[PDB]
Amino acid sequence: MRTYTFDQVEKAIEQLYPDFTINTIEISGEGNDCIAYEINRDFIFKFPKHSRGSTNLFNEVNILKRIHNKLPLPIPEVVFTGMPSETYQMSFAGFTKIKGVPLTPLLLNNLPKQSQNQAAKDLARFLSELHSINISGFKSNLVLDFREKINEDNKKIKKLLSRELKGPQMKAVDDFYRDILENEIYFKYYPCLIHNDFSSDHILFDTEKNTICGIIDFGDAAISDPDNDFISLMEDDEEYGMEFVSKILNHYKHKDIPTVLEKYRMKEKYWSFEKIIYGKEYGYMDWYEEGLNEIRSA
């Protein structure tokens, strides 16, 4: 897990942007795969902490360039890029900063009812448009084979938990992966471009106007199941209401809400296994054990 000083940052940007003058630089945030720097108050540079993060940062750039000016909400625009470097595909990238503030669930709930309603509508419209983008020219590296994903998870966890669980408790998971793979509802969907990390901290809001005014962070975006974009928002007490998103599903014209709820219920259970897998890949020994604890409890 890599780390950067302000200087290392300034100098990587100079390297390939010799005419670019850096007046101000502060840290804008940090996630599991990039550190974000706010530069000259106008740009957001993302620097990857590992290979996977660089690949996501590469995929984000590619995707933002290709859906530029096709959506009903502003999205960041790519202006700077870095370059491959051994392991890393990307190395950094600079996006325009979209002014605005996260549509936090607290912010949302403090809003007038009509303003809550207009937000649900605007989100609905955005996803409707996003999910309608023609997907013909996307390569495979951007497609998400869900069943392959579950199959490869099932292998990683069988290896991890072989040192952690006795037979009786291990059948409970073995049973859970089987139940999943046998249920077509997860695999039989009409695939489309999805944000795939669509939640409150990536939905920007303009309090002067009282309207959503940006959508950010396309690093996970991919060709996958459109229902994933509503599941991301449904967690009560952490994300938006289970009641708010049902307003979104309704402006969107969803024809099977019970299936979304069924997929949500499964993703909720699946979270423990992702903790175990990512806890081990990042080194987060606290993610690992907490996901492990959750499983000992099945």
CATH number of the domain that residue 43 is part of: 3.30.200.20
- What is the domain count for the chain? 2
Query: Does 137 share its domain with 285?
Result: yes
Would residue 267 count as lying in a domain? yes
Would residue 236 count as lying in a domain? yes
Q: What SS3 class is residue 89? A: coil
Answer yes or no: is 34 a known binding residue: yes
Cβ-based neighbour number of residue 198 at 10 Å: 24
Residue 213 backbone phi and psi in degrees, to 5: -140, 10
Instruction: Compute the distance between CA of residue 176 and CA of residue 174 in angstroms, rounded to an integer.
Output: 5
Residue with tokens 């996006």: 95
CATH of the domain at 229: 3.90.1200.10
Is the CB of residue 135 less than 8 Å from the CB of residue 193?
yes
Pair of tokens at residue 41: 């108050």
Query: Does 255 share its domain with 114?
Result: yes
Answer yes or no: is 46 a known binding residue: yes
Q: What does the DSSP 8-state code read for residue 235? A: -
Name the region of 224 (left: φ>0; alpha: ψ -120 to 50; beta: rest). beta
Q: Resolution in A for the shown PDB structure?
A: 2.4
Would residue 146 count as lying in a domain? yes
Answer yes or no: is 227 a known binding residue: no
Answer yes or no: is 98 a known binding residue: yes
At residue 50's C-alpha, the angle toward residues 46 and 56, to 5°, is 55
Query: Which stretches of 93-240 are assigned E, i.e. beta strand?
Result: 93-96, 101-102, 192-194, 203-206, 211-215, 222-224
Query: Does 210 share its domain with 283?
Result: yes
Would residue 87 count as lying in a domain? yes
Find the domain containing 44 and state its range.
6-96
Would residue 207 count as lying in a domain? yes
Is the CB of residue 122 less than 8 Å from the CB of residue 212?
yes
Is the CB of residue 142 less than 8 Å from the CB of residue 59?
yes
Answer yes or no: is 202 a known binding residue: yes
Q: What does the DSSP 8-state code read for residue 33? A: S
Is the CB of residue 33 less than 8 Å from the CB of residue 55?
no
Per this entry, what is the length of the chain? 298
Answer yes or no: is 220 a known binding residue: yes
Query: Does 179 share its domain with 244?
Result: yes
Residue with tokens 């901290």: 201
Instruction: Compute the distance between CA of residue 127 and CA of residue 122 in angstroms, rounded to an integer.
Output: 9
